[PDB]
């Protein structure tokens, strides 16, 4: 319900961060 | 625009149960099941059983679990209360108009079909040590327990709160039996507000038909004379001195009830000096301190108490009680003008009309009468009842106080607080 936009944003943070570090 | 007032309907079933609904057209509903069950119908053995039963209203029933009762009522914004007197237990539910059937369902489940599980009752035992200790912060409460204890012998001498030794000792079997004996048709009375009569009658026939032993003449309020004096070490010295008044059914009750208002009943003006109060003015002229005194009047279907309550310093109590006592004695000898009674009657009948104004007080008054008599007598007749009280009845009531056996109870530093024999 409410954690869908949060988990998507954290999903982006993790994705772009893993792309950043490597 | 003013709306029309409807008649309070009334039905009494063949099995003995009293029913009374008022179609209010209100936003809220207000339903109560009044029962002749309370501190008095306990005995020497099973004490504090009404107190635990009063607390246990949300415990698991046969039709609904404790969880379901709490959450189901709260989810509709409702609330289920229990209001015990010495005589009567008033299980009352409140809610919106569309959620009636629901609150009623839980109300009936609690009152007709409770389970009283061993572990749930055992879990609830320490709550009555709390609930007692909360109320006993008001020293009024403990003085009144001691007053009734010392005034009567067996029946009304039972404390409303559980005796301290009985904390933990009340059994689930005693609750079962206390319900089975007292929560019965001839002893019960279902009141309604903001609800149609036929459904309330049909529900009362369908569910509230359970009849057992103890119906219903009753027990004897054996009046006695006593004094218990609890040394407190408190800031003030709370005390009370009463004698046997009349029972609620007669015109004598109204004479005592008027005499209460002739004397200092209780203040009307915020931060006033208590002007028209008799007792306050009698003691004020005598001793010059911070104090309070007021006329205490208890009336039950069996018996009643009347006198006054005094609050004072260590030494002042001696003077305050005597001066108040002498002011009761001076009115007893026909020193009472007609305007004093005519004011007091107006204070009483106004105060009565104000007490029935809010629907909670109204319902408590309809439920009072449904048990006490088995009938309803509307405000106008009560106004006539008050206005018809003669001055002679007030002087005779005041005289019955002084002549009759005395019951005293006090708590504080009582070094200069008198005994009954010293009066």
């Amino acid at each position: 319900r409410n954690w869908v936009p949060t988990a998507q944003l954290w999903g982006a943070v993790g994705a772009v961060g893993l792309v950043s570090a490597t | 625009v003013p709306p029309h007032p409807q008649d309070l309907e009334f039905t009494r079933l063949p099995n003995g149960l009293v029913i009374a609904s008022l179609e209010n057209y209100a936003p809220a509903s207000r339903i109560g099941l009044f029962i002749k069950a309370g501190s008095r119908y306990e005995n020497s053995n099973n004490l504090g059983t009404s107190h635990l039963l009063r607390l246990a209203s949300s415990l698991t029933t046969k039709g609904a679990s404790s969880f379901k009762i709490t959450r189901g009522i709260e989810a509709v914004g409702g609330k289920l209360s229990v209001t015990s007197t010495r005589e009567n237990m008033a299980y009352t539910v409140e809610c919106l108009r569309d959620d009636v059937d629901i609150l009623m369902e839980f109300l009936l489940n609690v009152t007709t079909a409770p389970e009283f599980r061993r572990w749930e009752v055992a879990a609830l035992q320490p709550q009555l040590r709390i609930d007692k200790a909360v109320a006993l912060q008001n020293p009024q409460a403990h003085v009144i327990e001691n007053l009734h204890a010392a005034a009567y012998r067996n029946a009304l001498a039972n404390s409303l709160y559980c005796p301290d030794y009985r904390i933990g000792k009340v059994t689930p079997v005693e609750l079962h039996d206390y319900v089975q004996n007292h929560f019965t048709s001839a002893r019960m009375a279902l009141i309604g507000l903001g609800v149609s009569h036929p459904v309330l009658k049909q529900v009362a026939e369908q569910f509230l038909n359970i009849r057992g032993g103890l119906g219903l003449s009753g027990a004897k309020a054996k009046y006695h004379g006593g004094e218990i004096r609890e040394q407190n070490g408190d800031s003030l010295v709370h005390a009370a001195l009463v004698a046997e008044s009349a029972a609620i059914g007669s015109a004598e009750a109204n004479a005592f009830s008027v005499l209460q208002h002739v004397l200092g009943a209780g203040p009307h003006v915020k931060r006033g000096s208590n002007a028209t109060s008799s007792l306050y003015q009698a003691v004020a002229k005598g001793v010059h301190q911070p104090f309070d005194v007021s006329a205490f009047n208890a009336s039950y279907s069996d018996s009643g108490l009347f006198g006054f309550y005094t609050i004072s310093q260590a030494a002042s109590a001696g003077d305050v009680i005597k001066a108040a006592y002498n002011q009761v004695k001076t009115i007893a000898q026909g020193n009472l003008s007609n305007p004093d009674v005519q004011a007091a009657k107006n204070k009483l009948k106004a105060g009565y009309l104000m007490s029935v104004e809010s629907s909670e007080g109204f319902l408590d008054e309809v439920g009072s009468q449904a048990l006490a008599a088995g009938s309803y007598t509307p405000p106008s007749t009560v106004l006539q009842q008050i206005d018809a009280v003669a001055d002679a009845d007030v002087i005779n009531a005041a005289k019955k106080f002084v002549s009759g056996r005395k019951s005293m109870a006090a708590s504080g530093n009582l070094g200069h607080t008198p005994f009954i024999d010293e009066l």
Binding site: - | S65, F67, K68, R71, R118, W119
Partner: protein
């Protein structure tokens, strides 16, 4: 029908050789703990000893004499009626929490 092989499995289980009933060997959890807490003094203090004796046997690597073994017919299900209610109340709380 298969009450036979049920009775075989009971004997093959072996907790009866230690003088334990079936519900003494149930794995504790939140429901069982709660059911055991709800037990009246007698059944609690009995299971206490039955377990206390069975552990003492298990220490010594021994079992009871054959007559003292628990009987499939006389194996009372003392804990069930409580545990059923605890489970049903939890299911109710979950079904209410669902809405």
């Amino acid at each position: 029908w298969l009450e036979g092989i049920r009775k075989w499995y009971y004997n093959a289980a072996g907790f009866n050789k230690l003088g334990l009933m079936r519900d003494d060997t149930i794995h504790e959890n939140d429901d069982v703990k709660e059911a055991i807490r709800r037990l009246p003094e007698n059944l609690y203090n009995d299971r206490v000893f039955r377990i206390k004796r069975a552990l003492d046997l298990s220490m010594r690597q021994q079992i009871l004499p054959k007559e003292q073994w628990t009987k499939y017919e006389e194996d009372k299900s003392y804990l069930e009626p409580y545990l059923k209610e605890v489970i049903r109340e939890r299911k109710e709380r979950e079904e209410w929490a669902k809405k």
